Structure 1
Amino acid sequence: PISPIETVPVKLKPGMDGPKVKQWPLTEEKIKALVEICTEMEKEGKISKIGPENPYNTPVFAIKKWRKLVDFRELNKRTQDFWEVQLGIPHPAGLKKKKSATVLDVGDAYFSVPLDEDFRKYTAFTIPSIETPGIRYQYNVLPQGWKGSPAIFQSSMTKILEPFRKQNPDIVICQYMDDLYVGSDLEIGQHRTKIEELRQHLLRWGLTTPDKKHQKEPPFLWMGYELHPDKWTVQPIVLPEKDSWTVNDIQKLVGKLNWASQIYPGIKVRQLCKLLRGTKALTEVIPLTEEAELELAENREILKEPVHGVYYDPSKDLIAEIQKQGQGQWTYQIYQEPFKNLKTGKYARMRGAHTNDVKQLTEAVQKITTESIVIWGKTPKFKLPIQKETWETWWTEYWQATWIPEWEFVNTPPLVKLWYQLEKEPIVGAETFYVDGAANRETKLGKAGYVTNRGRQKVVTLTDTTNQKTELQAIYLALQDSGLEVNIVTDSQYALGIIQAQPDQSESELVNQIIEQLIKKEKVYLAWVPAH
């Protein structure tokens, strides 16, 4: 049965016209099946036999009894654009705990909604013959596979659930694709009655809902999750055992392993990723190293763990704690009651050209914060492994606007600290190294050195170098040769950057070397002066 709902006015993109694609020829066996299938739809009021006046046409196909398959790629290419059919998918940690939740599959509902009569002509398709004129039809409802069907269907479903919603504010209905998830804290008999009120209501509008054979029941498979009444879990993850792995198998594997590091703690893929070096083909067989066998081995044990979370309780705190797993790597868990996580995560090692741990920390906070506002419409209380004084010292004197929402300190090592702090003023009684680096940027042959006020000096000849690198090496040497307290003078523009940012990690091996040196000193003061 078709729905007595008004149509949405559709149009073809700017200027272009309906498709005129040629009908791929078929076997009597197939044409036969299509004729039958279509007769049914014509009967059901889904398609309409039309004449030759229609210059448009889309190719029809037969798959496996048989099933019709119309190819609208062309039409979709000429069909106007619609609203972003809700691109954001719901996360289990954001579903509110409910006494009862029911799933209502409103699938074949693409064929349940009317098509803008003005647009139906473009949907014309043709059933072959054994040759002679084939049988011609056009759709009277949203064609499965057509560009606007998803959006129009969802728009339609929304109008329909409008009254019911106003009449049952206790009840909550989620809309996702061809499905309705209806939940409430009503007594199970009451819930059931309202569900039936709804089926009947959707029915009223031409939307057949499941029968006892299609009805789904808990737990529910949701994008790799198993939703139970009082908790969710993740569908078991499978690691294919083999005695022969190709490049493709390994990447595939890394992919799944990477996804699991989010939920599971302890997943590693370094030795496995190592296997991808210099690969020549996807089918190429790569032998697993010992470390790789071990890795893959321990991971299997980790995935055999019962990792579960709980649902949202809008009346309790929303807490988010963070840890620094390693340099650039961060882990987090968002919970309300201790140990009962709503969700957990991990943030891949960002390889920024130059940054510091306190920065990366605030960046993690922000991602989590954005993520939270999306999932819960609120932003968490943060428990960060950084002292308030450490935060106070860095932020107030950092060239960039930065911030962290309400947070508290949690002493769960390793803590995030400042690896060093350039002196505010020159150091008294500290050697002063006047460093300098120059190089023929063309021949890439340069020299790096210094001259301290105490009479100490040095110069190094470097080949295959860049001016930036000589200047940087200049500084490295100074730090290297200086004592635990040094004053360094450079006309390097990049160093000017270090003075402002005071990075503790970067892309340059040189800078990294310098940072180690910087960290090691007890007092370092960097001064910049114009070149020449």
Structure 2
Amino acid sequence: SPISPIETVPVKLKPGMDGPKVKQWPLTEEKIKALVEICTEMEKEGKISKIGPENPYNTPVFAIKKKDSTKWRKLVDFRELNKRTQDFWEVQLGIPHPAGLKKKKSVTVLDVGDAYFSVPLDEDFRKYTAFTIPSINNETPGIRYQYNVLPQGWKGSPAIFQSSMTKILEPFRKQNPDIVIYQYMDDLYVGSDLEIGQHRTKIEELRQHLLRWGLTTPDKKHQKEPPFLWMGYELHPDKWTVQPIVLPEKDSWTVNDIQKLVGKLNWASQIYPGIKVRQLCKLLRGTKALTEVIPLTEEAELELAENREILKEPVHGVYYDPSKDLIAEIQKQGQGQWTYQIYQEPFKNLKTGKYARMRGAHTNDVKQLTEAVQKITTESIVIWGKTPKFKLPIQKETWETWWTEYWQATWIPEWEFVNTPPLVKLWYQLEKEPIVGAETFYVDGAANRETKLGKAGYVTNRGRQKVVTLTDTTNQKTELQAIYLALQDSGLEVNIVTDSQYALGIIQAQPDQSESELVNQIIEQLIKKEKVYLAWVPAHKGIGGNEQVDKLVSAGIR
């Protein structure tokens, strides 16, 4: 195997740090012998060099046998040198997504033989790679070598190799702009739109160019055939798709089977639309051991079932055509679950995906929709370098109402309404004005930090009044309670005045679902209502009936 003549990459240890010097443990004779055989071969091939004992550095060597086989493998434990080597630049900051690859007429995969050994190591660095095959027992100085190429498991190898591969490809690229090569580890993906003709030719020219730099690769009849499996996907001449997924037939589920299931479904959801996972996830929370069986909830069951249904029979994604548009569609799937598909030509998907995240404690469909739009928008820029035209299940008017009045700044790239129920809508509006001839409730809550007991109640202005007690609450809780009462005892139209900016905040946002049971009840009230007007006053400022509901819930609490 050749050792690329290419320029070296200068390497340093970390400032105020010196190379390693960890002592070599004593080995058995068979181990000792195996290493001698392995090393002199590497030495012959130029991969290593013998050194004196003037060099003061050392890294443990070990030798293991073979998973099944009968050869020996040499293990050099670079932990110590690794903790002393500088940091490098991140190898590869993301991986292409298949839905972003342009179609090529013809593509072939090359792989480099012995990547790391084919490339040299900064001279002034080799000395720190010193290792020692010891002699039989303590006696005798051991045999001592150091590396001349990139060692396996050293911190800088992935970066410098790939950095090297780039340097080496740069020109060929230059004089071949219409051929794309993708570098992954020690694979090359090479595609072009030339007829097989000088595709193979052009391949050959690549190979030579590589071989000229000390890099060797397979030849026709040696190279993988499509579909090329990779990073979990399946790549075909005209499509791509995730690698085969199998949901095991199973009587009993352990935490561990379900964790794995959830993982395959998630993965599956990049191209199988409608994949659901909530019910399954629900099972995992507050978890026990991996080996523990979990009884499958009935929703979890309908969910598992509808998932086997979807996976029943293959689905694939298409590749990307830069001369056409990107359309993204989103459907509300339910309990905070969103689903989406991206295509260029109606219904031939490039990819699919889902969004669920609970963003905040209380939220509404309109906020979720636009969070999904953001997340999909970022993904498009990464994958295609442009944002898609959106098609959303929400009227222009609804959107306009909401964005316009919301405190927080918002935006959405080009979209159009599409009529696919469930449609997104606000489930109630607070008034802008006080309602004439509707009862005013002045509500209030108070909690004792010690006892954690609380009172909550109200006083209206037709003299009505009420006060409830609560036994393990908080101020926040007593103040939602107080508003919840005022909503229980008032019928279709009501003005409510609280001094809780907290409840106000939550409610002005038109939440339509929450993690708080209490906040939900408040919601069904607000939806039953017909005209609610809510308003804030600062508490403990002798003021309206506020001062009364105050003393009312204070007596006893504080």
TM-score (norm 2): 0.90
CA distance in 1 between counterparts of 2:54 and 2:193 reads 57
Aligned-pair distance for 1:41? 1.5
Asked if the contact 2:328–2:343 (Cα under 8 Å) also holds between the matched residues in 1, the reply is yes
Write out per-residue CA displacement over residues 263-300 of structure 1, whole angstroms, 9 at most, x where no aligned residue. 33444455555655665432334455676666545534
CA RMSD of aligned residues (A): 2.1
Write out per-residue CA displacement over residues 44-76 of structure 1, whole angstroms, 9 at most, x where no aligned residue. 11111111111111122223x222221111111
CA distance in 1 between counterparts of 2:506 and 2:295 reads 44
Aligned-pair distance for 1:338? 1.3
Query: What aligned pairs does 1:270-419 form with structure 2 within 5 A after superposition?
Result: 272-273=280-281, 276=284, 280-286=288-294, 295-350=303-358, 352-419=360-427
CA distance in 1 between counterparts of 2:488 and 2:225 reads 68
CA distance in 2 between counterparts of 1:214 and 1:120 reads 35
Q: Which deviates more from structure 2 when the two are superposed, residues 333-342 or residues 501-510?
A: 501-510
Q: Which deviates more from structure 2 when the two are superposed, residues 372-381 or residues 519-528?
A: 519-528
CA distance in 2 between counterparts of 1:107 and 1:368 reads 39
Structure 2 residues without counterparts, runs of 5 or longer: 65-70, 541-558
Aligned-pair distance for 1:348? 2.6
Aligned-pair distance for 1:255? 3.0
Asked if the contact 2:59–2:78 (Cα under 8 Å) also holds between the matched residues in 1, the reply is yes
Write out per-residue CA displacement over residues 137-180 of structure 1, whole angstroms, 9 at most, x where no aligned residue. 11101111111111111111111111111101111111222221
Asked if the contact 2:108–2:223 (Cα under 8 Å) also holds between the matched residues in 1, the reply is no
Aligned-pair distance for 1:81? 0.3
Distance 1:286 1:400, change over 3 A: closer
Write out per-residue CA displacement over residues 179-217 of structure 1, whole angstroms, 9 at most, x where no aligned residue. 211111111112111111001001100011124575211
Aligned-pair distance for 1:425? 1.2
CA distance in 1 between counterparts of 2:293 and 2:476 reads 43
Q: Tell me the SS of whatever aligns to 2:114.
A: helix
Distance 1:399 1:93, change over 3 A: same
2:35 corresponding residue in structure 1: 34
Distance 1:312 1:74, change over 3 A: same
1:7 corresponding residue in structure 2: 8
Write out per-residue CA displacement over residues 19-56 of structure 1, whole angstroms, 9 at most, x where no aligned residue. 11222332322222222222121111111111111111
Q: Tell me the SS of whatever aligns to 1:31.
A: helix
Asked if the contact 2:452–2:471 (Cα under 8 Å) also holds between the matched residues in 1, the reply is yes
Aligned-pair distance for 1:256? 2.6
2:198 corresponding residue in structure 1: 190
Asked if the contact 1:107–1:179 (Cα under 8 Å) also holds between the matched residues in 2, the reply is no
Q: Tell me the SS of whatever aligns to 1:266.
A: coil
Distance 1:355 1:451, change over 3 A: same
CA distance in 2 between counterparts of 1:242 and 1:111 reads 47
Q: Tell me the SS of whatever aligns to 1:218.
A: coil
Q: Tell me the SS of whatever aligns to 2:324.
A: coil
Asked if the contact 1:398–1:500 (Cα under 8 Å) also holds between the matched residues in 2, the reply is no
Q: Which deviates more from structure 2 when the two are superposed, residues 207-216 or residues 117-126?
A: 207-216
CA distance in 2 between counterparts of 1:39 and 1:123 reads 16
Distance 1:469 1:329, change over 3 A: same
Q: Identity rate of aligned residues, in percent? A: 100
Aligned-pair distance for 1:469? 1.2
Distance 1:423 1:286, change over 3 A: closer
Q: How many residues align?
A: 531
Asked if the contact 2:241–2:271 (Cα under 8 Å) also holds between the matched residues in 1, the reply is no
CA distance in 2 between counterparts of 1:495 and 1:355 reads 14
1:59 corresponding residue in structure 2: 60
CA distance in 2 between counterparts of 1:463 and 1:289 reads 33
Asked if the contact 1:247–1:282 (Cα under 8 Å) also holds between the matched residues in 2, the reply is yes
Q: Tell me the SS of whatever aligns to 1:324.
A: strand
Structure 1 residues without counterparts, runs of 5 or longer: none
1:124 corresponding residue in structure 2: 130
Distance 1:269 1:331, change over 3 A: closer
Aligned-pair distance for 1:504? 2.0
Aligned-pair distance for 1:243? 4.3
1:105 corresponding residue in structure 2: 111
Asked if the contact 1:310–1:340 (Cα under 8 Å) also holds between the matched residues in 2, the reply is yes
Write out per-residue CA displacement over residues 487-517 of structure 1, whole angstroms, 9 at most, x where no aligned residue. 1111112123135423222332212221221
CA distance in 1 between counterparts of 2:439 and 2:296 reads 53
2:460 corresponding residue in structure 1: 452
Distance 1:38 1:177, change over 3 A: same
Distance 1:461 1:242, change over 3 A: closer
CA distance in 2 between counterparts of 1:280 and 1:109 reads 44
Asked if the contact 1:128–1:134 (Cα under 8 Å) also holds between the matched residues in 2, the reply is yes
Asked if the contact 1:351–1:506 (Cα under 8 Å) also holds between the matched residues in 2, the reply is no
Q: Which deviates more from structure 2 when the two are superposed, residues 308-317 or residues 173-182?
A: 173-182
CA distance in 2 between counterparts of 1:291 and 1:475 reads 34
Distance 1:298 1:27, change over 3 A: farther
Asked if the contact 2:271–2:317 (Cα under 8 Å) also holds between the matched residues in 1, the reply is no
Q: Which deviates more from structure 2 when the two are superposed, residues 174-183 or residues 300-309?
A: 300-309
Aligned-pair distance for 1:90? 1.3
CA distance in 2 between counterparts of 1:167 and 1:161 reads 10
